[PDB]
A paper describes a structure:
The smaller proportion of particles exhibiting a defined RNA organization, in contrast to MS2 (>90%)18 and Qβ (~30%), may be due to the more heterogeneous RNA conformations inside the capsid. Nonetheless, we achieved a 3.1Å-resolution asymmetric reconstruction of the mature AP205 virion, enabling us to construct a complete atomic model of both the capsid protein shell and the gRNA, which consists of 4,269 nucleotides. In our structure, 178 copies of the Coat self-assembled into a near-icosahedral shell (with the triangulation number, T=3), measuring approximately 290 Å in diameter. Surprisingly in contrast to MS2 and Qβ, which have a single Mat per virion, AP205 possesses a distinctive Mat-dimer, resembling the shape of the letter “F” at a pseudo two-fold axis of the capsid and increasing the length of the virion for an additional 70 Å. The two copies of Mat exhibit different conformations: One Mat (referred as outer Mat) extends further to elevate its apical domain away from the capsid shell while the other Mat (referred as inner Mat) is embedded deeper within the capsid and has a larger bending angle between the central and basal domains. These two Mat proteins intertwine to form hydrogen bonds and salt bridges at three sites. The third interaction is within a six-helix bundle between the two basal domains, connected by a salt bridge between Asp321 (α5 of the outer Mat) and Arg347 (α5 of the inner Mat). These interactions hold the two copies of AP205 Mat together, forming a dimer that nearly triples the volume and doubles the surface area compared to a single Mat in ssRNA coliphages. The 3’ region of the gRNA is proximal to the Mat-dimer on one side of the capsid, while the 5’ region resides on the opposite side. Notably, one RNA stem-loop originating from the 3’ end of the AP205 gRNA, which interacts with the Mat-dimer, is partially exposed outside the capsid shell. The AP205 gRNA is highly branched, presenting a total of 88 stem-loops, two of which provide specific interactions with the Mat-dimer via multiple π-stackings between aromatic amino acid sidechains and RNA bases.
Single-stranded RNA bacteriophages (ssRNA phages) are positive-sense RNA viruses that have shown specificity for gram-negative bacteria by exploiting host retractile pili, including T4P6. Acinetobacters have type IV pili (T4P), which are involved in twitching motility, surface adhesion, biofilm formation, and natural transformation in gram-negative bacteria. Our study delves into the interaction between Acinetobacter phage AP205 and type IV pili. Using cryo-electron microscopy, we solve structures of the AP205 virion with an asymmetric dimer of maturation proteins, the native Acinetobacter type IV pili bearing a distinct post-translational pilin cleavage, and the pili-bound AP205 showing its maturation proteins adapted to pilin modifications, allowing each phage to bind to one or two pili.
Author numbering:
A (entry chain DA), B (entry chain GK), C (entry chain GX), D (entry chain GY), E (entry chain GL): 1 to 129
RNA sequence: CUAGUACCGCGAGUUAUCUUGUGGUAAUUAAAAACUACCAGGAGAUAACUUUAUGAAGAAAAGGACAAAAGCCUUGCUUCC
């Protein structure tokens, strides 16, 4: 039951969503479409840039029930860019799906968030046996 | 019990742990292997430096309960460097054990931390009778 | 038991012990008291340096050995420094055994003295669960 | 009873005592030994400077005590210098004995502490009748 | 049952092992991967430098092992370099296997180790009849 | 008192972090009086680099004599620093 956003800046190359209850949080997606001559063939390349921004209150040190004592907000941001030829969209979606698993198995379930990299983490590619 | 730290940076020359609860707490172990020349014999020397760091906020003058403002924190650092030939590790451990007791006599049980030195403390060497 | 040392050089800040039978073995403790001031608080910082020195003969020809080979000697040293304010000394002692515990589980039980590092070793915090 | 101090800095001339509970409380003694000649005979004069320092917090309460209003300390210093040849040390102790009573009359029992001189106060000499 | 080693230092392109009992013994594996351009047949090349180092004491005089006399150890080194395209690795393994056969002919079975070269020994090709 | 005895010092620079806090930049103030935002900056603690004490090591490419070279030298790079 997440709060849905509404578009704010609608443009042929950029749309920004923001939450009515919390105007601070945003999610903006921008596309840059380009035509590429990779070799003896002309191809249409697209680079979609998706960024989600959230301003959250700081840790709120313990034993501080007082309401109007207010801390500043840090910067929780996530940026993603997807670059690939349009005709290879079907196989590109496989890349996006497996990219999520690699990040999740390394950061979500792993400890990459705290700042530690696990060389023995098991990550796999899109290609299957 | 105690919350176990988890490594944040790992390297064959140094490893740094940190408390996931608070990142200020730190315990870093570093090594410096060295090949040391003695009389017609070559011996492998290892010098391991171990540092434990804690940020403790103020002494918090008692009487009144703490108002919710952060106290500037001081550094409580314990640094330990152990140097010796690798092959004499068996006897160096005994030297480490008696070293712990000697410091405990001066500091854990004495008033060394307050800045006082007792020239009558009982100090026992690694060699036994 | 172990042979006690007697004080050698009683200085304003440094006292050095030494075994009467073996003058090579020493245990010197030096104190440095500093006047440090933090936010609206006056602190007495104490940095205690403790050095344990032992000169150990070489591994001694393996296989066997007589009682007249007398190999050269090599330096075994252990230095620890304890830095912090005396105002919160009682809690400063808390990480001392924790620092003792962390090094023991990493160097005594482990093989860090040889030159190895164990990124998966159990390192526990001073604070309690 | 009274909490004893421990020596801090030891020197051939000066030794400083400080209280473990209150590091600021201080009793320092410094001696300057010198040879002087008056009746074509050398005399070994000893000058002993004794200083006692305490930091009494000024009378903070004004009806209101409160948990943690902390207002600064004041200087309470007592310095005594004892001079005279060690040859007449036996009678010089009696001089110290008399000096104590004379000061006690003016200050300990009288109102010299308030800042008043009593001309008719009873003052007696070391020499007895 | 040969003694197993564990890695000493890790690097992006270098791993070394050493025996805990004897730190002198080492085994270094270093890789160098580089992009090789060919006649419009792109290839990936690797260069593996494998070094085995042993410090062995010089041979004691014949007919006497009793006397625990230590000769200064000498350096024994075996270094191997493998270069080739990763695509042709499968047949390159046969190259390595054949290389062993030729060396064993001169070195192990033969006496090329003593400094004597035999232009008669059978040297077989990698490919089969 | 002064051959000695004995006594004294332990530190460089740059950068960042924390604490203290000298001035300046403007505000309320007739005001750089004093609180505030920034900088410079005296001081104490910590971290990184050149280099100090005193620095030391790790070859793998190049040139130097030479066959374009390696082995004899240094430099690229790194380590506590």
């Amino acid at each position: 039951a997440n709060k849905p956003m509404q578009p704010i800046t609608s443009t042929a190359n950029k749309i920004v969503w923001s939450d009515p209850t919390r105007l601070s949080t945003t999610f903006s997606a921008s596309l840059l479409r380009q035509r590429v001559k990779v070799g003896i063939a002309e191809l249409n390349n697209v680079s979609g840039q998706y960024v989600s921004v959230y301003k959250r209150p700081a840790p709120k040190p313990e034993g501080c029930a007082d309401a109007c004592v207010i801390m500043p907000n840090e910067n929780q941001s996530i940026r993603t860019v997807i670059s690939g030829s349009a005709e290879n969209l079907a196989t590109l979606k496989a890349e996006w799906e497996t990219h999520k698993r690699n990040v999740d198995t390394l950061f979500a379930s792993g400890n990459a968030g705290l700042g530690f990299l696990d060389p023995t983490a098991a990550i796999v590619s899109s290609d299957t046996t």
